[PDB]
Symmetry: C3
Subunit: 211 residues, 3 copies
């Protein structure tokens, strides 16, 4: 299948996992600013647009860490071999959003192809889920406003291990262009170290060649 069962008994975090999954169930969010000064430059020298590029880079970073691709399947802890991004699309006409997903691909060009293709087919579709699989990552965008913090207050997040990432409008801060990015995870599968690792990797990706 496209997932492997995780060896929970020999895992270094097995105590932590039981602890934060059942003893003291919790998750946390954190908002940090990513420096997109370099990325903006690379975007400027290309035909790629900002949203699709950030989706790609967030999916890329996620795809690099097992702890960000865990799930409960058949009451067992698994790791997805790979996850596809699920992202929000605003409909200016109805002022409502939809959620769409498209297959992740390590080739940025093939990813762009997938993205346009999905966007092509459902741009007009106002259902909440126009498409109607489980190895996903959630990405949302609030481009109309800058924020220093964002937190989702969910009534029930039992065994909800997929990361939720929210980005705000970027802004010029001195000489840098900063993007606020909120990350919300479940404490059973992710510690603060794990989140900081993801953010630092994303920052390095933004600071690198697209191709």
């Amino acid at each position: 299948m496209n997932y492997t069962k995780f060896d929970v008994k020999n895992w270094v975090r097995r105590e932590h996992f039981e602890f934060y999954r059942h003893r003291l169930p919790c998750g946390f969010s954190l908002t940090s600013k990513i420096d997109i000064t370099t990325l903006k430059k690379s975007l400027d020298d290309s035909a790629y647009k900002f949203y699709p590029v950030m989706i790609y880079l967030i999916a890329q970073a996620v795809n690099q860490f097992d702890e960000l691709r865990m799930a409960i399947k058949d009451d067992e802890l698994i790791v997805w071999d790979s996850v596809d991004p699920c992202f929000t699309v605003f409909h200016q006409e109805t002022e409502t959003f939809s959620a769409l997903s498209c297959p992740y691909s390590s080739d940025i060009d093939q990813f762009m192809v997938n993205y346009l293709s999905v966007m092509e087919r459902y741009k007009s579709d106002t259902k909440l889920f126009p498409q109607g699989p489980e190895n996903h990552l959630f990405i949302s965008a609030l481009p109309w406003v800058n924020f220093d913090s964002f937190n989702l207050n969910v009534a029930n997040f039992t065994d909800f291990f997929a990361p939720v990432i929210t980005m705000a409008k970027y802004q010029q801060e001195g000489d840098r262009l900063l993007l606020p990015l909120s990350v919300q995870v479940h404490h059973a599968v992710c510690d603060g170290f794990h989140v900081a690792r993801f953010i630092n990797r994303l920052q390095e990706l933004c600071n690198s060649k697209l191709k």
Copy 2:
């Protein structure tokens, strides 16, 4: 009455409403900084004080968007024709706060009259609710400290649709005076677009003549 029943069946967000009200119940908070450089100037040229003015302007912006004045009445979705601000009052003597409300009025002078009047009558009243109706907005102030984020962790927010707004101590950031403002809403009636719209409108109001 002072409210209208909302047409949920022909609403563009009907799916979203059921989704975030019962399928996946949730709300979110966001903190953004409002630029009060201009407002400070207008305040300086007037006899109005800061708190009462912000309450007025927050109530004014709210009063402009239906999605911020929704409620459940008799198991039905309604919109208040208008909401009155409910705001916190600190008692230096007991170091405790109270919550008071006063009628909103589009005339800033008449609003000030209402405010002083309520403050006059209960300044000495240490009960939590000295006054003892439901079309409200909640406004709170933390003037003693600056914050970049604020979030309320509520054990049960079922059908709780009124916005909660928290403001921190403002501060000088370069050439601007910024005020941190947290907004917490229920995802059944408000999307990120809706919150960004409110904040942008508030910013425009701060940047405009008081009268």
Copy 3:
């Protein structure tokens, strides 16, 4: 014993306490930046390290306010005469953390002695709680990344009154070195005033001689 039963009937906040403990159960978090420009200087002129010093100063500030040392014992409201810090320790080897506590002491040198001693004995211990009493404060550190906000989403926090403090990586902001610090408390025992008071006291402590 090391705690006193609190006089809830003659307390100015008795209504607030019942209100936020049972009527509308809630807590809140807030992230603010502390200016550690001065502290860094004092650290530079000493042999003390950053983490142990912040733990000491956070415990010191806490130890100064009753509202931050409340608990439910035998279904009664009590105040701890003093609380000891419980702080996280990262294991680079396993990339996992542990929680340790050590006795608080108003003498910074004796505190350092306690700290080293605990760290000495369990540096190698990967259990979640290597040590296996209740008058504590929770301190956590995310030194690998800067954040503007941090919030813990806990499924059940009934009667959980001990403060939770999270610090991020500090950073240079103009001429100042700022440290992001998140504070999460229960609204039954703490108001926004109470949190601002703690943060302002901490800022003053950072800005003062160590000894």
